[PDB]
Structure formats: structure tokens, C-alpha cells
Design a protein around this ligand. Structure first.
Ligand SMILES: Nc1ncnc2c1ncn2[C@@H]1O[C@H](COP(=O)(O)OP(=O)(O)OP(=O)(O)O)[C@@H](O)[C@H]1O
Ligand SMILES: CN1CCC[C@@H](Nc2nnc(-c3ccc(C(F)(F)F)cc3O)c3c2CCC3)C1
Length: 818
């Protein structure tokens, strides 16, 4: 006679009022979830806490599945709890979902066979809810899978027997897969929280997810967290100030877990009348510091604890029974000690399982196990399984293992580590880096950013430098301040990096990136800097321009890409060209360098001592109005030899102006990249004058103009001139047809300077090609690709071309279409 939804909501509202559903809450005080600090959500572009499933603007298409992703300790699990509570309180999705079902991926194993009893297991104490009634209705429920990457057991996407029908019992991975794929209870919305490392598995199940990334605390939010943690503002201020001075620790504290660990550590020593010691710089240092302060005041059974953690990692166990603790010599002692000073939790949510505070802690202890004095005790085995889902990726186990190896160590727990073992681990870790650094493949295992963090953690100059000698190239993507901090350290200590690519991600449009650019200026060996495909807008270009004026810059190639360069920022680029004596190549493609921007660039290019040799201005929205300045550069500049100005709005007068100055016999222009300049037959005579006059012009690219048959005739007259030295002529779709084939045939026999001639997607016809085959037999000087790309023929012509390829081997490539 009563509506179960009311009781369900009450149960959820009462249950989800604890951060970790645990005891040992600083004397088991009220959790007070009001302490929650707002996390920012970014759509893979800020998104509201609500409207996560709502339809987008395009086609009003709704999303059933939403996936949250983020770093360990970012608070994925807490955000999920907050949503659950806000719903139960009638604030979030008040009119969208009747039930929210929390699934703890730490509790649900894959091996055990079971029906979809999740709707009962996570509900109120009443064992017989109305499953067949309102609970049955699709589109009215939301599932929350919290910690996909924490699932214990092997998990494959390759499941045939998905087994729909909630009434039937099946294996956990099968049941899970069916729900994720929306085969089980179709139209049931699903929210997943996971570390990005598990996306390699989810990508095959989600099909059409919406992705949202979770960010950590902002500077203002960090302040709020620290204050909320303490009852005494004076203590919060003293603690905040200490951390703020430690720039490195403060940076790390953007992760909620890190600031939690730091706060707890400081509070515990504060209560003892200590001066608030804290010198941690690395993630490992924070965890070591925490355990040192916690256990030092105990550690006799630390080996057993480390063994327990190591066993759990290898045997796929997060939750432990009292029987498992007893089997490690842990009974009626350690558990109590770890509750008086929270190190280990009982998860007292009407349950008898024990666990670590966080998976990060469990991995820490497992790593510690490898440096002491029984699943392995072999680092080789540990490393070989690093990238495997089945072992939880072992990211922190290894990352901490690196951090725990050093010479600059003291007392307090870490003194119990064996020197001989540590030295052996160091050598094995270095060999591991060499192998992974060389194996430059796309994968979740080390991909040139993580081999870096796993180095930062070991602040030893000799080790890091030795490792860096295996990194001739660095290709990384920086997401947050933490990546900039690590990248800066690593790059600064590099001596043999020749090529660096920094794919900055949205945080730029700020001075934020300054922290890394200032490092590049001190490099002695860096040659190529690639800053393509990122929003290095005006202020980004400005800080880089300052960086590039440094006397120790030593950068030769500046490959800017779609940076969104504007009219004004080009000024700063000019100031680099006129000062920097080493820069050779510059690529400003796909920017808004309008006529104004080019004029400024040209001022720099005409400056004495500008040694720029290759200039790319492709797709720069250029018009004929600016060709006058580029023409002046070609005339006066002795160093510029390669110019690419295609994919612009140039006209006939545009190229003719460049030609009138480029024809000068003292011009050093070698490559004229008029790939797509909207050229017509009228302007061709200008190109002809240049070809017969410029003895340095070896390559002409007209791949996309509309030269036409009259145009090619005129171009031929130029090319046929005895003083023309052109080696490569590229004529892609120029709207040429059979009517001009007689001149192209003549060109092949009369011009002795050409080595390559390539016709592209144009209907030359069969007559032209057949003639080519015969004339090319007459001791032709053309050896390179004949082209005729994307052009198709009958069988007779194809046979002739195949014959040509074999009959005269001197022509390396005929390039038949098939
Ligand atoms: N908004 C917040 N307010 C207060 N504390 C927070 C917040 N977000 C995260 N924390 C801190 O994060 C810690 C919990 O980390 P959490 O369990 O969320 O990691 P996780 O990656 O979600 O783990 P799992 O993947 O197993 O769910 C808590 O100790 C808590 O203090
Ligand atoms: C994910 N994976 C591939 C991409 C690059 C790299 N990314 C990160 N890794 N680790 C942490 C990280 C956070 C917290 C703690 C601590 F809590 F233990 F201190 C350690 C960490 O190592 C973070 C990031 C980015 C966000 C914070 C590794």
C-alpha cells in the first residue's frame, strides 16, 4: 500500500553521509559531507553537475551512458557519492530518476555467478523489494559503477553469451558487460567512474558514451579545503602557510587525496606539540612522510603488512577477511593501531571486510615489499606485468618503487630497507626505462609522460641523466600543472634530446606555460621544437618569442601549427627573426596571418642577419595585397630559399608580382610552393620568365591551380628554354586535358633539365599516355615518378604502362593506378 520509492530514498539519504563509509574518523566523529569541495567537470568546456545525460543541441540526441574519468585520488568515488546524496535529498535529477543504484566495483567480483540482485544488494534492509513493479520500468533508473578499474579478476570485452534477462544468474564479467553495453535493461542510464588506464577496455563496450573529465582543486578551493579541515582557523592558517611555501607540495595538493594525507599528517604531529615539519617534494615523499609520522610514535609487523598488500596485488584482492590477516601474523594488534591512527579501515558499513584507505596506499605497501630483507619478491616479474589490467596496471607499485630507491635517506621506517636489494632494483629499473623508451608505440604502458613521472620521483641526478640518454625524442601532452612540473624537471635535465613536441592541452591563453618554455631556452642540444595542434594563442606566442631571444636558445626549427596566431602576435615573431641567429625553419601554417601580419613578418625577414631559409605560409588567408612584401623579401633576402604560399586567395597579379622580383638572376629561391594559389593561364607567362632566368629554381609546385591547356603551353615555352634548370615539375589537377598532351610529350623529349614530372588528377587521355610511353624510350633524362596519379585507363594503356616500367628500368616509378 506504500510507495517503496520513499523508503528507498530515505535509506540512501541516511547511508551516503560518509566520505569512505568507515570508522576511525579522527575519533569516529561525524563525517559532515558539507566538507565536500566542489570539483570542476569538463566535457571532452565546463559542464554542470546536472544535465549530464540530457540531450545535446544537435538533433536533441539524449545520452544513456556517461563516463567520468580522472587520476587516482582525484575524488571520482566522492563525486559519485555526492550525486547519490543530492538525488536522495531531492535536488539532483528530481524528476528524471526513480532509483539510483550504487555498485561498488571493489565489492563485486567477476568469478561468482549471480542474478541481477544488485538492485537488492544496494537497497534498504528489506530483502524483498518490488522488483517486478515500478523498479522494473526502463528510463527511470540510473546505475553507478564506481571504480571500473578496481574490478578484481581478468576482464575481457570478447564476450559472446552476454545473457540478457535480469532474472537469470550468470558470471560477473558477463553480467557487467551486458549492462555496460545496454543489452541488460535497455534504456537504463549508466554512469561509470574510472581511471583513464581502463579506457582500453571500456572503449569496446561503451559504443556511444559521453565523456567528462574530473579536475582537482583550484587555488581558492584548496584554501577552502584546508580551512574546513580544522576547527581552529589559526591552525588552518599555520598549516596552509607552511604548505604554500612548499610550492611543489602545494602543486601536488591539487589532488584531494594528497591534501588529505598532508592535512592528517600535520594534524597528528600538531597535537604532539611539533613545529609542523614537512619537506616532501615527491608523491613518494608524501606517503613516506605520512607513514613515518603515523607509525614512529608499530612497525614491527610492517613486513607482514607489506606482504599482505603485495599478496592482494598479485592475487587480485582489495578486501580482506580476518582469516587473511591472521595468516600474515596480523591479529588483535595492528588493526586497532591502524584505527587509532587511520592507516587501515574496517569499512564498517554493516560488513566484515577490511581494506586499505586507498588503492594508492595498498600499492605503496606492495612496492615497499620489494625492498625489504610471498607472491614473488622479483622486480623483473613485477615490471613484466606492468601494463596488464589483470594486475591493476601496477602504476603506483612501480612509481613508488622508483621513489623508494635513493641514497638521500634517513631513519624512520625506510632504514629497514636493504642496500644490496635497492642497488639491484635501481639497475633493473634503468634497463626497464631503456627498453620502454625505445619501444615508442601507442599504449597505456609507458608512453614518454609516465616514464617521466616515474623518474621525477627519484630525485637523483646521475640516475635521471642516465635514463634521459635513452630519450632522443620527447612527444608529450600536458594536461595539468602536475604534468608541467614533472615535464619541466625532466626536460631541464636532458642533454641528448634533439626533437621535442609539446601538445599543450586546455588547462592555454595564459602565462601558465611559461614554466616550461623557460626550460627550453637552456637546452644545448634541442634542435626541433614542435608546437603544432594546440591553442598557443597570442600570449603563448609572446612568451615563446621572449624565450627564443635567449642567447642560449640553440633552436633551429620552429614548427608552429594551428596556434591561432593573429595580426598583432606576428610582431613578436618578427622580433625573433631579426635577433635569433640560429633559427633556420619557420612554419606559420593555418593561422590568421592576414596581409597586415605578413607585412610585419617581412620587415623581420628583410632584416640583416636573418638566417631563415624555409618559410611556410600555407593557408594563411593571404591575398594579393600582401604579395608585394613577400616579393620584396625574395629580392633582398639572400638566405630565403624555400617559400610556400599555397592554399591562399592569391590571384594572377599576386604571383606575377612575386615573379617579377623572383626572376632576378641573383634570387636564391629554390622551391616555389604555389600549391593552390588560384592561378590561371594569364599569369603563366610570369612563371615562364622566372623559370628561364632563375638558375637556382629547381622545384615548382602547382598542385591545385587551374592552369589549363593554354597555361601549360606557356609554361612549356619557358621550360623548353635552354637556360631553364627546373628539376621537378608537379602539376596535380590543373584541369589539363588531351589537347595539351602534345606539348607535354614535347617537353619530355626537349627538356634535359627535368628529372621528375608528375601529372595528377586530370584527364590527360590515352593518347597522351601512350605517346609518353614511346617518347620516354628515346634516352629520356626523366628518371623519377612519371605521375599520372588517380588517372584511370583501358586495358591497352595499362599494358603499355606495365611494359614501360619493365622495358626501361631507368624510370623508377611509372605509378600505375592499380
Ligand atoms: N570534494 C571533496 N571534498 C573533500 N574531500 C575529498 C573531495 N574529493 C576527494 N576528497 C578526498 O579524497 C579521498 C577519497 O579518494 P577516492 O576514494 O575518491 O579515490 P578514487 O580514485 O575515487 O578511489 P576509487 O577509484 O577506488 O573509487 C578522501 O579521503 C577525501 O578526503
Ligand atoms: C594517468 N597516467 C597517464 C597520464 C599521465 C599520468 N597522469 C597522472 N598520473 N598520476 C597522477 C597522480 C595523482 C596523485 C598521486 C598521489 F596521490 F599519490 F600523490 C599520484 C599520482 O601519480 C596524476 C596524473 C594526472 C592527474 C594527477 C599517468
Amino acid at each position: 500500500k506504500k510507495d517503496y520509492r520513499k523508503k528507498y530514498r530515505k535509506y540512501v539519504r541516511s547511508r551516503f553521509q560518509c566520505i569512505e563509509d568507515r570508522n576511525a574518523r579522527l575519533g569516529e566523529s561525524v563525517s559532515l559531507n558539507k566538507r565536500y569541495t566542489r570539483l570542476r567537470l569538463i566535457k571532452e568546456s565546463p559542464i554542470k553537475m546536472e544535465l549530464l545525460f540530457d540531450p545535446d543541441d544537435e538533433h536533441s540526441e539524449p545520452v544513456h551512458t556517461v563516463v567520468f574519468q580522472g587520476a587516482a585520488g582525484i575524488g571520482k568515488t566522492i563525486l559519485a557519492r555526492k550525486m547519490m546524496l543530492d538525488w536522495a535529498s531531492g535536488t539532483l535529477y528530481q524528476d528524471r530518476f526513480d532509483y539510483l543504484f550504487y555498485i561498488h566495483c571493489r565489492e563485486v567480483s567477476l568469478v561468482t555467478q549471480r542474478s541481477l540482485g544488485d538492485l537488492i544488494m544496494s537497497c534498504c534492509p528489506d530483502p524483498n523489494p518490488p522488483i517486478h513493479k515500478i523498479v522494473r520500468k526502463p528510463s527511470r533508473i540510473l546505475f553507478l559503477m564506481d571504480g571500473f578499474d578496481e574490478l578484481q579478476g581478468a576482464f575481457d570485452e570478447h564476450i559472446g553469451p552476454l545473457c540478457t534477462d535480469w532474472q537469470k544468474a550468470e558470471r560477473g564479467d558477463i553480467l557487467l558487460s551486458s549492462l555496460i553495453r545496454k543489452k541488460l535493461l535497455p534504456e537504463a542510464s549508466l554512469l561509470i567512474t574510472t581511471r583513464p588506464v581502463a579506457l582500453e577496455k571500456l572503449q569496446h563496450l561503451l559504443d556511444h558514451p559521453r565523456h567528462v573529465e574530473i579536475l582537482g582543486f583550484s587555488e581558492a578551493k584548496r584554501k577552502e579545503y584546508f580551512f574546513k579541515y580544522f576547527s581552529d582557523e589559526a591552525q588552518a592558517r599555520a598549516a596552509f602557510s607552511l604548505i604554500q611555501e612548499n610550492e611543489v607540495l602545494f602543486t601536488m595538493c591539487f589532488i584531494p587525496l594528497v591534501c588529505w594525507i598532508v592535512c592528517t599528517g600535520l594534524k597528528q604531529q600538531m597535537e604532539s606539540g611539533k613545529s609542523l615539519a614537512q619537506t616532501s617534494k615527491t608523491t613518494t615523499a608524501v606517503y613516506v612522510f605520512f607513514l613515518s609520522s603515523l607509525l614512529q610514535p608499530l612497525c614491527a609487523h610492517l613486513w607482514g603488512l607489506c606482504s599482505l598488500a603485495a599478496d592482494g596485488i598479485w592475487n587480485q584482492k582489495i578486501l580482506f577477511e580476518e582469516s587473511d590477516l591472521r595468516n600474515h601474523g596480523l591479529q588483535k594488534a595492528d588493526v586497532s593501531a591502524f584505527l587509532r591512527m587511520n592507516l587501515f579501515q574496517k569499512e564498517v558499513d554493516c560488513e566484515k571486510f577490511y581494506s586499505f584507505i586507498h588503492m594508492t596506499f595498498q600499492e605503496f605497501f606492495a612496492a615497499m615489499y620489494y625492498l625489504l630483507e610471498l607472491p614473488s619478491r622479483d622486480v623483473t616479474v613485477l615490471l613484466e606485468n606492468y601494463g596488464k589490467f589483470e594486475k591493476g596496471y601496477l602504476i603506483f607499485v612501480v612509481r613508488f618503487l622508483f621513489g623508494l630507491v635513493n641514497q638521500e635517506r634517513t631513519s624512520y621506517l625506510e632504514k629497514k630497507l636493504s642496500c644490496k636489494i635497492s642497488q639491484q632494483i635501481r639497475l633493473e629499473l634503468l634497463k626497464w626505462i631503456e627498453v620502454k623508451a625505445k619501444a615508442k608505440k601507442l599504449q597505456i604502458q609507458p608512453s614518454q609522460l609516465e616514464l617521466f613521472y616515474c623518474l621525477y620521483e627519484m630525485q637523483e641526478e646521475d640516475f635521471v641523466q642516465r635514463a634521459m640518454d635513452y630519450f632522443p625524442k620527447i612527444e608529450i601532452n600536458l594536461s595539468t600543472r602536475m604534468d608541467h612540473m614533472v615535464s619541466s624537471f625532466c626536460i631541464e635535465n636532458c642533454h641528448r634530446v634533439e626533437s621535442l613536441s609539446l601538445g599543450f592541452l586546455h588547462n592555454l591563453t595564459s602565462s601558465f606555460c611559461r614554466g616550461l618554455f623557460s626550460v627550453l631556452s637552456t637546452s644545448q642540444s634541442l634542435t626541433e621544437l614542435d608546437l603544432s595542434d594546440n591553442s598557443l594563442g597570442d600570449p603563448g606566442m609572446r612568451v615563446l618569442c621572449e624565450t627564443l631571444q635567449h642567447p642560449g636558445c640553440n633552436i633551429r626549427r620552429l614548427w608552429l601549427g594551428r596556434c591561432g596566431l593573429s595580426h598583432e602576435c606576428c610582431f613578436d615573431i618578427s622580433l625573433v627573426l631579426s635577433s635569433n641567429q640560429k633559427l633556420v625553419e619557420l612554419d606559420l601554417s593555418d593561422n590568421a596571418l592576414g596581409d597586415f601580419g605578413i607585412r610585419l613578418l617581412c620587415v623581420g625577414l628583410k632584416h640583416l642577419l636573418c638566417n631563415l631559409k624555409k618559410l611556410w605560409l600555407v593557408s594563411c588567408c593571404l591575398t594579393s595585397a600582401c604579395c608585394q612584401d613577400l616579393a620584396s623579401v625574395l629580392s633582398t633576402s639572400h638566405s630565403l630559399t624555400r617559400l610556400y604560399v599555397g592554399e591562399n586567395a592569391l590571384g594572377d597579379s599576386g604571383v606575377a608580382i612575386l615573379c617579377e622580383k623572383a626572376k632576378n638572376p641573383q634570387c636564391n629561391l629554390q622551391k616555389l610552393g604555389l600549391v593552390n594559389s588560384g592561378l590561371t593561364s594569364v599569369c603563366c607567362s610570369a612563371l615562364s620568365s622566372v623559370l628561364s632566368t632563375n638558375q637556382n629554381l629547381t622545384h615548382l609546385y602547382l598542385r591545385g591551380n587551374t592552369l589549363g591547356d593554354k597555361g601549360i603551353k606557356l609554361l612549356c615555352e619557358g621550360l623548353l628554354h635552354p637556360d631553364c634548370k627546373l628539376q621537378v615539375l608537379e602539376l596535380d589537377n590543373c584541369n589539363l586535358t588531351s589537347h595539351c598532351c602534345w606539348d607535354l610529350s614535347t617537353l619530355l623529349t626537349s627538356s634535359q633539365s627535368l628529372r621528375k614530372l608528375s601529372l595528377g588528377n586530370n584527364d590527360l587521355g590515352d593518347l597522351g599516355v601512350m605517346m609518353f610511353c614511346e617518347v620516354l624510350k628515346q634516352q629520356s633524362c626523366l628518371l623519377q615518378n612519371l605521375g599520372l596519379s588517380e588517372m584511370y585507363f583501358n586495358y591497352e594503356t595499362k599494358s603499355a604502362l606495365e611494359t614501360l616500367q619493365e622495358e626501361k628500368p631507368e624510370l623508377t616509378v611509372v605509378f600505375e593506378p592499380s
